[PDB]
Amino acid sequence: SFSGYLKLTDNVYIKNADIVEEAKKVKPTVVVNAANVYLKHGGGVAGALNKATNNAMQVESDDYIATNGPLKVGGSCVLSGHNLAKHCLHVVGPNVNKGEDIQLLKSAYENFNQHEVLLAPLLSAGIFGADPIHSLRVCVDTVRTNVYLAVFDKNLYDKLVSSFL
Numbered sequence: 661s662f663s664g665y666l667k668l669t670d671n672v673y674i675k676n677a678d679i680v681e682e683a684k685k686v687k688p689t690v691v692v693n694a695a696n697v698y699l700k701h702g703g704g705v706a707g708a709l710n711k712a713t714n715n716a717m718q719v720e721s722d723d724y725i726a727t728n729g730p731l732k733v734g735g736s737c738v739l740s741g742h743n744l745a746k747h748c749l750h751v752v753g754p755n756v757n758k759g760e761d762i763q764l765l766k767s768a769y770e771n772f773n774q775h776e777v778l779l780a781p782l783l784s785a786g787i788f789g790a791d792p793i794h795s796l797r798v799c800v801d802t803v804r805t806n807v808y809l810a811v812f813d814k815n816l817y818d819k820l821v822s823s824f825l
C-alpha cells in the first residue's frame with residue numbers, strides 16, 4: 661500500500677514523489693492523470709504517465725476521443741491504467757494558461773469521489789497554471805474519498821505542507 665505520506669486530513673495524504681514512480685511501486689487501483697479535453701498527453705504529468713506506458717495510454721486515448729469526442733473541462737473518463745495502475749482516471753482541471761475558469765477546479769475534484777482510493781497529482785497545478793496551494797485547498801474541501809497526492813517538486817511540497825491550514 662501507500663507509504664511515506666503525510667496525513668493532512670481524515671482522507672487526504674501528501675508525499676513528495678514522482679507520480680510515475682509512485683504508480684509503478686504501488687500499482688494503485690486508480691491513478692489520476694492531469695488530462696486535457698483532447699487526451700493529448702504531451703507534457704506535465706500526462707506526458708510523463710503516457711511515456712511510462714510506452715505511448716499505450718495515448719493510443720487508447722485517441723481511440724476514446726475518436727469514439728466519444730472531447731471531455732469537458734471539469735470532467736473525466738476512466739481508461740486503463742496500463743502498467744501503472746488498474747485504471748487511469750483522466751481528469752481535466754481548468755488550464756489557467758488557456759484562460760479557463762478556475763471555478764471548474766472544484767468540479768474536476770468531484771470526479772475523485774467516484775473512487776474509494778486514488779493516487780493523484782494536484783489538479784490544475786504545474787503547466788496548467790493554477791496556484792497549487794489553492795488546488796490543495798479545493799482538494800481537501802471537495803474530495804471525500806481517500807486521496808494520496810504526489811507532488812513532484814520538493815520545494816513546492818514543503819511550501820504546501822508548511823502553509824496547510
Ligand SMILES: OCC1CCN(c2ncccn2)CC1
Pocket residue numbers: 677678679680704705708781782786810811812813
Ligand atoms: O517528467 C517527470 C515527471 C513525473 C512526476 N511529475 C509529477 N508527479 C507528481 C505530481 C506532479 N508532477 C512531474 C513530471
